[PDB]
Amino acid sequence: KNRYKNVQTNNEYFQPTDLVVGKDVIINGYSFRILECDEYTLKWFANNIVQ
Amino acid sequence: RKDINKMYTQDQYILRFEGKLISQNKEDNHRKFIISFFCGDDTIMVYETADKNSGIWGGKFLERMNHNNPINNKPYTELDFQIGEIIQLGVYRFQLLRADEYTHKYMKSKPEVFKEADIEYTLNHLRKFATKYKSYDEFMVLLIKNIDPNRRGVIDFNDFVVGLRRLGYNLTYQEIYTLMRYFDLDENWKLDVKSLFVALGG
Amino acid sequence: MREIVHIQGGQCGNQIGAKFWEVISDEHGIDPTGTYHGDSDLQLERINVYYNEATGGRYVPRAILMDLEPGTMDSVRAGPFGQLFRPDNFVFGQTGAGNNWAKGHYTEGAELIDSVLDVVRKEAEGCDCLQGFQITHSLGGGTGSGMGTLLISKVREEYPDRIMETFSVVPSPKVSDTVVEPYNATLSVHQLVENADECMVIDNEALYDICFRTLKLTTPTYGDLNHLVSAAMSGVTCCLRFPGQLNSDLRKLAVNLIPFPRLHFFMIGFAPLTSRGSQQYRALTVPELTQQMFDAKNMMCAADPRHGRYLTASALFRGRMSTKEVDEQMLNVQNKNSSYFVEWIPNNIKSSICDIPPKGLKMAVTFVGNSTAIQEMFKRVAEQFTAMFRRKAFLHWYTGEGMDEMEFTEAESNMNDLVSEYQQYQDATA
Amino acid sequence: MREVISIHVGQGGIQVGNACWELFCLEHGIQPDGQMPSDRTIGGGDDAFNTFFSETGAGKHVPRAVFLDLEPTVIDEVRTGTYRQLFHPEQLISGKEDAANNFARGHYTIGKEIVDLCLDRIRKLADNCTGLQGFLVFNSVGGGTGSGLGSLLLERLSVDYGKKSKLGFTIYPSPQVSTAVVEPYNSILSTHSLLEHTDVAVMLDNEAIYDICRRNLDIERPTYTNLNRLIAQVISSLTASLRFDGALNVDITEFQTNLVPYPRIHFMLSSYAPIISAEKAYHEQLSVAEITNSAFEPANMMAKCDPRHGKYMACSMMYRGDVVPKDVNASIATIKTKRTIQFVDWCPTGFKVGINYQPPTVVPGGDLAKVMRAVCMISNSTAIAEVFSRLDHKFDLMYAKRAFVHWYVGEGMEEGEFSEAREDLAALEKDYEEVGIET
Amino acid sequence: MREVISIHVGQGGIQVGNACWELFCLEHGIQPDGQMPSDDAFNTFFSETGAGKHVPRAVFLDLEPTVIDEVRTGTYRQLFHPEQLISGKEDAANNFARGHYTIGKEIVDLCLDRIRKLADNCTGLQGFLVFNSVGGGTGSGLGSLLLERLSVDYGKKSKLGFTIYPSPQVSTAVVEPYNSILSTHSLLEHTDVAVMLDNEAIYDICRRNLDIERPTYTNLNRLIAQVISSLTASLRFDGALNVDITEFQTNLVPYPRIHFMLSSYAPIISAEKAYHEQLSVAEITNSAFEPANMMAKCDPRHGKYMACSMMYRGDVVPKDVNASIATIKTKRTIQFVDWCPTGFKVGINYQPPTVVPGGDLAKVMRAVCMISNSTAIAEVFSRLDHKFDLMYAKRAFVHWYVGEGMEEGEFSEAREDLAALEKDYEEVGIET
Amino acid sequence: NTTQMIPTYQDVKTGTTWLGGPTHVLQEQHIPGYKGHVKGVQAESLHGKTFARITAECLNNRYKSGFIVDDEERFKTNYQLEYIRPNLRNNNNRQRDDEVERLELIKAQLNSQPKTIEDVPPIDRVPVIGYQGFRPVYRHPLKQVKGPTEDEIDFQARTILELTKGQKEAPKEIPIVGYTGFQKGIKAENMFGKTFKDLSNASNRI
Ligand SMILES: Nc1nc2c(ncn2[C@@H]2O[C@H](COP(=O)(O)OP(=O)(O)OP(=O)(O)O)[C@@H](O)[C@H]2O)c(=O)[nH]1
Ligand SMILES: Nc1nc2c(ncn2[C@@H]2O[C@H](COP(=O)(O)OP(=O)(O)OP(=O)(O)O)[C@@H](O)[C@H]2O)c(=O)[nH]1
Ligand SMILES: Nc1nc2c(ncn2[C@@H]2O[C@H](COP(=O)(O)OP(=O)(O)O)[C@@H](O)[C@H]2O)c(=O)[nH]1
Ligand SMILES: [Mg+2]
Ligand SMILES: [Mg+2]
């Protein structure tokens, strides 16, 4: 549990919008792919990110 | 007083030549020599090479010193040390056959002193002689016919010099070498007449 | 060639090892995936000292992480550069020592050491020309102080000629966090003196002193403390990994620093250290490097050297600098402060030069000094120990696990004898 | 037809040897890769490189040198440098474990497993030569392997070849500024070994060269590399007469026949002049008269010993450049007349003079400027008795309390070797006062 | 007009003969299929078909199919004659009894069939070359049977065996001391010249000269092939001093029982450092006489020399050869037996040593092959006898031999023969 | 930095200054003994390169500064920084380009005659007479040969001509014999019998 730099965006800290399902992401020199998300987040995403 | 400034700025330049001795004796009509010229203080060293299984005691022939030409009573300079010349060191006369590659670069790198070593001067020298002939075009055909008897295209040094002497044009041995070496495409010392014709005019 | 394998035990040891391997990996340009990404050839010149090669072109450190509880390793493994460690090298118990020396030295450590002794022997046997071993642990906890020392005793029997290094974190009196500090610390030193070739003393109180006043940090963490220690530890073996004007390996330091076999307790200090605000106002020249070398507040121990006299001193410079300035300053300091230097051994300072500075720096300093002012550590530990032992406090736990109270006595006397003779050379004159 | 073999041991030996060979390659025109240039197509002239180099039959040359050490870090840097193609691959002998400033380790424990390889290598170099003049050795005496293997090699070389000449260039520890702490032991123990096994020895103390560079060359932050170029210059003027023609030739054998009055007394200290920087080199004439005055100037001594405190036994100096023999004789007459410089009573004549024609060469990226005249001098004096006195003072201090003795006893050297080493130094000293007294 | 026949028996024999014949083919310029690329001298080793390909004068013997199989599927399948590659079905299984009394008896007839057919074509047969590894079953037993049959079947013809003995401490099998002694006893009175090429020495030679730290069997066989070529180049290339096969046993064999000798070759230098030295004839002989450079694991410094045989090839000069001999004689650490004042035989050939492309060795204009006979050879026999005595004392591994026709008391007479050989070697080395 | 760029080739030939040189016309110095600030002496701890050259360094602003060193210039030792040949007086080996193309010539030549597409003689289409083996009955008797295709042979030939006097370079340049470095995976992948000089190439080529 720590704050990690994101190479994909000007060596900035991660933001909740960065983690997008279906698209790959980079953490600490490792490459991950997001397959699915908990639908609790899906409710959170629909209520706060829609602007 | 001794010229320190010349010693400082021209100590590194050393001219190395290969030569053969011209003398009455048939004893030494074959053995080769290497001649070194230190231009720092106009000092000349002559080395005598020895072949294996020859029986001759090779080694240093003349140690380095400074000595002048007997005819004009003037010290030798780098201008007089041009390839093809005969240099008389005391009672020994040497004929300069071939020069070191670094030496050839040195003479070519410094113009307005070694005039015979500059190509455009040699071409201008040869071309300027066409004034006595009637026309420029007939000068070319006369030259190629005289130089090349069977028009083979590539000639030797001996054929090249004998043709020029037959025409009656007085080229020093240095300029003849300069033109010969330049027009050698694959470096086997055979003149390319076709490029010579183009260089003169096409 | 001269490679060394890393041995580290206990949670105090593990947290130090985690930061140290990160520093070396960054120094040699090793990514968290274990693949080289450097630019200069010299970074791969002497990498065999610490890194082993596997198929696929990846590097793995030759470190052994050892403990009595699996909680610490499950935390250190997930950290940055934590995937480098080979999972086989991890060895842990299922019970723990509970800050009790006897549990970690007689009951659990004895049966557990069979496994960990197998893996370390495999590591030592693989390398063609072993140089030595280095240790990192703390003397305040039973698992670190008990099974760590019993490891030292066994390994010394199998490699009596190989060099051995130990970093000890002795408990400072002011910031003390356990009640059983004097018992296990006193007993561990008794075994430590007989077997360890070299000992470095590190006090967390001193580290707290340095960070608050030199770097001027409001809220440091153990990571910052671990960062300072790793910088010095890399400095000792740095010139063993890089070419320089004057080479100096581990063996050279030992012979040139300890005049007598039973005096191998040191104190270390790292320079230069500067706060971010004052980082742009200083000038990195030899006089500033050597003036902070010997300054009292920069030592990694709570022992002030001006209460005693230096026996011998050593210094390791990193970077490109003129040799004359290096030697000139050593003679300069050794003259203006003749009261702090023992007289019967002239020229008691050693110097070395390494051409590769640490990353982000131009010139560096690593100082290791043997001074008679560190006896106050054992003097104060002795008085708490005799305060504990006179009333037989917390003793039924220790005596209830196969040992009697007698072993407490000679360890007290042997440590007591150590202080007396170590103090003898302070007033000795020729 | 005359060859000399150079021996280098220790880190100081390798670094000194490295600076010497770049001078030799540039002096004879050798490129780093071995061919002279790729430009000169004549060759076959003025064979003088045979003294230091050896032809392979067609093309490159290989130096007649050997590199010996016990830690590979310094040697490995040579193999990855720009001179990787010059030396033969298997004459740069490297060990596995460093001596670690321990004389015993480098004399009885580790050196035995590596001394065999060198003698096999040396035998193969000597068989190639036909007119081998002698061996040169370079060693930093303050280091463990430098004095360790150096002691072992000289003892073995004494019986393998016998009367063959061996020349020594030691680098003694400085009186007050030193690298290590245990240097008095391994330095003193070295003297006993080399006293009866070397023919000529020269002191090359570091701080003396520090003074020269600061005062003359005007360098405020010198390093060992600047120093090694001066000693390399000394070697050049020392053996120049072997391969260069001059008015008077002085060979290697002319030193152990002119400079040591007695077999026990073969320790000497050298000087070099002029040493001047390019910006102020051209502001004075550098006359041969004044350059020989600078050599006898004790402030330019290359060892931290003042000859004014003792007498002179013999003085050998070599000139190179465009010197005139009558000018040389004129300056020598003034030196004898000078009252502050005195000679020993039983030496009415004490000068050996050599003249060479080749001026010293200038190395690009160097420090000295190029001059038409230079002199290198080797002097034997009773003033060399003081350095052993201060070493005896320091050695006795920490041997009274038997400090560091466990670092030597446990490696096979018995205790009694310190006692005999001390007595020989005392006997060696007593010789120096005995000789220095007048009749 | 001169011919020599090569015999390769046992896996070591085939794997060394492959390198030998590849080297010969490259040296003589034949294509792998056997057809000359349109270019007399090669008649010593080959045989013309009248017009077309050439047939090597070799026969391959083995009792196990796979090793011979690679010969018939490699690049040289079309070279050799199809029925000169004789292979059996079942192996000796390291049992000297099996390869000398049970299964090797029924193949020697066809071996001699092929030998007779090859020799009948030959008109000036000089001698036979035999290759075999001693530490093996059919290498020893079948070899012993073949030599015993060939001695009576050909009379006084010279036979040379380039055997391979087990190394002193590095070994592969566990019963190889047993079959080495019986094979040595069998060959002692049946071979004329024997050369020892134990494997451990070649490993050190490779590691020290060719700068190979992880060698394989391909490297070792190339050196042996080079040795064979240097030894037999005088039969097919002109030179200043030519020597035949017959003028070896008249020079290096002081007594009939003493015909065991060891070889050395120089130079062997990798191309990385081959051009750093001129390879003078004066120094190549020093490398040849270096005790560490011996191709057999024996120390010549521990005993007296009997005779030395020298082969120089390249562009050597007779004067330069003799100066090196004089220098070696003046040297003190090398001493000869008392009753041998003159102890050298010298050979000079003009053909330079050939280089295999893509190989290990560099190309040199000079080389020397040294064959010496010395009293130091007793050490290997002594250690072999000690190893056997440790084993045979309580009769280990004896049922695997006695059950195949081997008599129980056969080991005792072999031990007696070895003791007699040791006695002879010690009595020769004493001064009169 | 002044030691290698000053007396340039243009100035040394037909110029005022020789190798030693009173190079004060060309740039600025401070005639040894001088009291004053130089802006680069005490700050950078410049070593060697006597005072005349030190001032020329600071005056002409080649220079360096800062606590942080940008990797590349950080990783230089004193040995190769100073002993970089002779540079400026007058204006290396060609090897390791010939060695690689000799190696490739053997490989290309070896691949040149693999008997592609029924160019084998009538013999050798079937194996040798006494072959042992298996010889499956339900298989085509005559062997099948594929062989390399034409462009692959031409692919190798292009590089051979290209490498000789072309754009491609010598691979890496390597140490000689006893260099005790890592050598980049000689032990990880066995590579046992490949002639350490040659072994260096294969491991370093990757
Ligand atoms: N003049 C001079 N002295 C040197 C040089 N290098 C080392 N030394 C001297 O050598 C002494 C220490 O020994 P080193 O040369 O560094 O190493 P070593 O001789 O191999 O001995 P060990 O370190 O034990 O292996 C120092 O006190 C220096 O005085 C050098 O380049 N020039
Ligand atoms: N020099 C060399 N010796 C070899 C080689 N292959 C096997 N050997 C030796 O041969 C001995 C064992 O015999 P093998 O070659 O395996 O075969 P063999 O002699 O016919 O014995 P069997 O296997 O029982 O039939 C081993 O001890 C090796 O020393 C090789 O390629 N080169
Ligand atoms: N420098 C440093 N010291 C630590 C760290 N963690 C613990 N310590 C010290 O270790 C001592 C207690 O160690 P302990 O938990 O008993 O280790 P254990 O023996 O493995 O149980 C305390 O006095 C702390 O000062 C750390 O991360 N860094
Ligand atoms: Mg050293
Ligand atoms: Mg077999």
Q: Which helix (H) or strand (E) holds C312?
A: strand C310-318
CA dihedral C323→C327→C332→C338, nearest 10 degrees, is 160
One domain, residues C197 and C221: yes
Q: Which helix (H) or strand (E) holds C241?
A: helix C238-241
Distance, CA B65 to ligand 2 centroid (Å)?
A: 73
DSSP secondary structure string for all residues of C331-395: HHHHHHTGGGB-SSSSS-EEEEEES-PPTT-SSEEEEEEEEGGGHHHHHHHHHHHHHHHHTTTTH
Please give the tally of structural domains in chain C. Answer: 2
In sequence order, the 6+-apart residues with CB closer than 8 A to the CB of E319 are none
Q: Which of C374, C392, C416 is the last residue of a domain?
A: C374
Question: Is C337 a member of any domain?
Answer: yes
One domain, residues C181 and C301: no
With a 6 Å cutoff on the Cβ, whether E18 touches ligand 2 is no
CATH assignment of the domain containing C308: 3.30.1330.20
One domain, residues C230 and C354: no
Q: Closest-CA residue in chain F for E72?
A: F128
Residue D423 annotated among the catalytic residues of the structure: no
Residue pair F9/F88 in contact by the 8 Å Cβ criterion: yes
Q: Which of C358, C374, C390 is the last residue of a domain?
A: C374
What is the distance in angstroms between the Cα of D74 and the nearest Cα belonging to chain B? 34
Judging contacts by C-beta atoms under 8 Å, the chain D residues touching residue C350 are 179-181
DSSP secondary structure string for all residues of B135-161: -HHHHHHHHHHHH-SS--SEE-HHHHH
CATH assignment of the domain containing C252: 3.40.50.1440
Q: SS3 of D256, please?
A: coil
Question: Is C408 a member of any domain?
Answer: no
Cβ contacts from E onto F, under 8 A? 54
Which residues sit opposite B21 in a β-bridge? B94
C-alpha–C-alpha distance, residues F67 and C240, integer Å: 24
C-alpha–C-alpha distance, residues E236 and E44, integer Å: 7
C-alpha–C-alpha distance, residues F206 and F203, integer Å: 5
In sequence order, the 6+-apart residues with CB closer than 8 A to the CB of D268 are D200, D201, D202, D203, D259, D378, D379, D380, D381, D384
C-alpha–C-alpha distance, residues E79 and E75, integer Å: 9
In F13-170, which residue ranges form alpha helices assigned H by DSSP? Answer: 41-44, 51-59, 78-82, 98-111, 150-163
Q: How far is CA D189 from CA C197, C217, D107, E213, in A?
A: 26, 53, 10, 40
Per the annotation, where are the binding residues of D?
11, 71, 140, 144-145, 179, 206, 228
With a 6 Å cutoff on the Cβ, whether E198 touches ligand 2 is no
Residue to substitute from E276, E279, E280, interface D, most D β-carbons within 10 A: E276
One domain, residues C278 and C242: no
The data reach a resolution, in angstroms, of: 3.7
Residue C17: domain span = 3-256
B34 to D45: CB separation less than 8 angstroms, yes or no: yes
Q: Which of E119, E101, E20, E10 is nearest to E62 (CA)?
A: E10
Judging contacts by C-beta atoms under 8 Å, the chain E residues touching residue D59 are 275
- Technique employed here was cryo-EM
Question: Which residue is catalytic, options D183, D196, D220, D254?
Answer: D254
Question: Is C16 a member of any domain?
Answer: yes
> Which DSSP category does C87 fall into?
G
Other beta carbons within 10 angstroms of residue D333's beta carbon come to 9
Residue pair C97/C146 in contact by the 8 Å Cβ criterion: yes
Distance, CA D8 to ligand 3 centroid (Å)?
A: 50
> Which DSSP category does B162 fall into?
H
Strands ordered across the beta sheet of B43-48:
B59-65, B43-48, B32-38, B14-22, B92-99, B86-89
Q: What's the token pair of residue B183?
A: 């027009």
Q: Is the dihedral of CA C176, C177, C179, C180 positive or negative?
A: negative
Residue pair D138/D13 in contact by the 8 Å Cβ criterion: yes
Q: Which of E235, E163, E195 is nearest to E370 (CA)?
A: E195
Question: Is C417 a member of any domain?
Answer: no
Q: Closest-CA residue in chain D for F88?
A: D364
Residue C282 phi, psi (nearest 5): -85, 170
Judging contacts by C-beta atoms under 8 Å, the chain E residues touching residue F130 are 72, 82-83, 85
A28 contacts chain C (CB < 8 A)? yes
C-alpha–C-alpha distance, residues B21 and B94, integer Å: 4
Residue pair D29/D49 in contact by the 8 Å Cβ criterion: no
Residue pair B121/B112 in contact by the 8 Å Cβ criterion: no
Q: Closest-CA residue in chain F for D282?
A: F22
Residue pair F126/F141 in contact by the 8 Å Cβ criterion: yes
Is A touching D (3+ C-beta pairs, cut-off 8 A)? no
Judging contacts by C-beta atoms under 8 Å, the chain B residues touching residue D361 are none
In sequence order, the 6+-apart residues with CB closer than 8 A to the CB of B162 are none
Q: What's the token pair of residue D244?
A: 């260069």
In sequence order, the 6+-apart residues with CB closer than 8 A to the CB of E382 are E422
F128 to E218: CB separation less than 8 angstroms, yes or no: no
> Which DSSP category does B75 fall into?
B
Other beta carbons within 10 angstroms of residue D397's beta carbon come to 16
Question: Is C228 a member of any domain?
Answer: yes
Note the ligand closest to the C-alpha atom of E141: 2
C-alpha–C-alpha distance, residues E360 and E223, integer Å: 10
One domain, residues C78 and C216: yes
Question: Which residue is catalytic, options E3, E22, E48, E247?
Answer: E247
3-state secondary structure D277-333: CHHHHCCCCCCHHHHHHHHHCHHHECCCCCHHHCCEEEEEEEEEECCCHHHHHHHHH
Residue F12 phi, psi (nearest 5): -70, -40
Q: Which of C418, C429, C420 is nearest to C263 (CA)?
A: C418
Q: Which of C351, C374, C397 is the last residue of a domain?
A: C374
C-alpha–C-alpha distance, residues D329 and D331, integer Å: 6
One domain, residues C45 and C120: yes
List b or e across C134-147, with b for residues whose CB sees 16 or more CB atoms inside 10 angstroms: bbbbbbbbbbbbbb
C-alpha–C-alpha distance, residues D275 and F32, integer Å: 15
One domain, residues C50 and C153: yes
Task: Sort residue B91 into left (φ over 0), alpha (ψ -120 to 50) or beta.
Answer: alpha
Q: How far is CA C67 from CA A28, C77, C142, E249, in A?
A: 27, 13, 11, 74
Question: Is C110 a member of any domain?
Answer: yes
What is the distance in angstroms between the Cα of C430 and the nearest Cα belonging to chain D? 7
Q: How far is CA C66 from CA B36, B136, B146, C71, C72, in A?
A: 77, 100, 99, 12, 10
Residue pair D29/D36 in contact by the 8 Å Cβ criterion: yes
Q: Which of D154, D24, D156, D14 is nearest to D73 (CA)?
A: D14
Q: Which of D80, D151, D77, D166 is nearest to D115 (CA)?
A: D151
Peptide bond into C182 cis (omega under 30): no
B9 contacts chain F (CB < 8 A)? yes
One domain, residues C64 and C123: yes
Per the annotation, where are the binding residues of D for Mg(2+)?
71
In sequence order, the 6+-apart residues with CB closer than 8 A to the CB of F200 are F174, F175, F183
One domain, residues C251 and C270: no
Question: Is C397 a member of any domain?
Answer: no
C-alpha–C-alpha distance, residues D68 and E323, integer Å: 33
Is D touching F (3+ C-beta pairs, cut-off 8 A)? yes
In sequence order, the 6+-apart residues with CB closer than 8 A to the CB of D402 are none
Q: Is the dihedral of CA C243, C249, C252, C258 positive or negative?
A: positive
Cβ contacts from D onto F, under 8 A? 108
One domain, residues C329 and C214: no
3-state secondary structure chain E: CCEEEEEEECHHHHHHHHHHHHHHHHHHCCCCCCECCCCCHHHHCCCECCCCEECCCEEEEECCHHHHHHHHHCCCCCCCCHHHEEECCCCCCCCCCHHHHHCHHHCHHHHHHHHHHHHHHCCCEEEEEEECECCCHHHHHHHHHHHHHHHHHHCCCEEEECCECCCCCCCCCCCHHHHHHHHHHHHHCCCCEEEECCHHHHHHHHHHHHCCCCCCHHHHHHHHHHHHHHHHHHHCCCCCECCCCHHHHCCCCCCCCCCEEEEEEECCCECCCHHHCCCCHHHHHHHHHCHHHCCCCCCHHHCCEEEEEEEEEECCCHHHHHHHHHHHHHCCCCCECCCCCCCEEEEEECCCCCCCCCCCECCCCEEEEEEEEEHHHHHHHHHHHHHHHHHHCCCCCCHHHHCCCCCCCHHHHHHHHHHHHHHHHHHHCCCC
Question: Is C386 a member of any domain?
Answer: no
One domain, residues C158 and C28: yes
One domain, residues C189 and C67: yes
In sequence order, the 6+-apart residues with CB closer than 8 A to the CB of C183 are C101, C385, C388, C394, C398
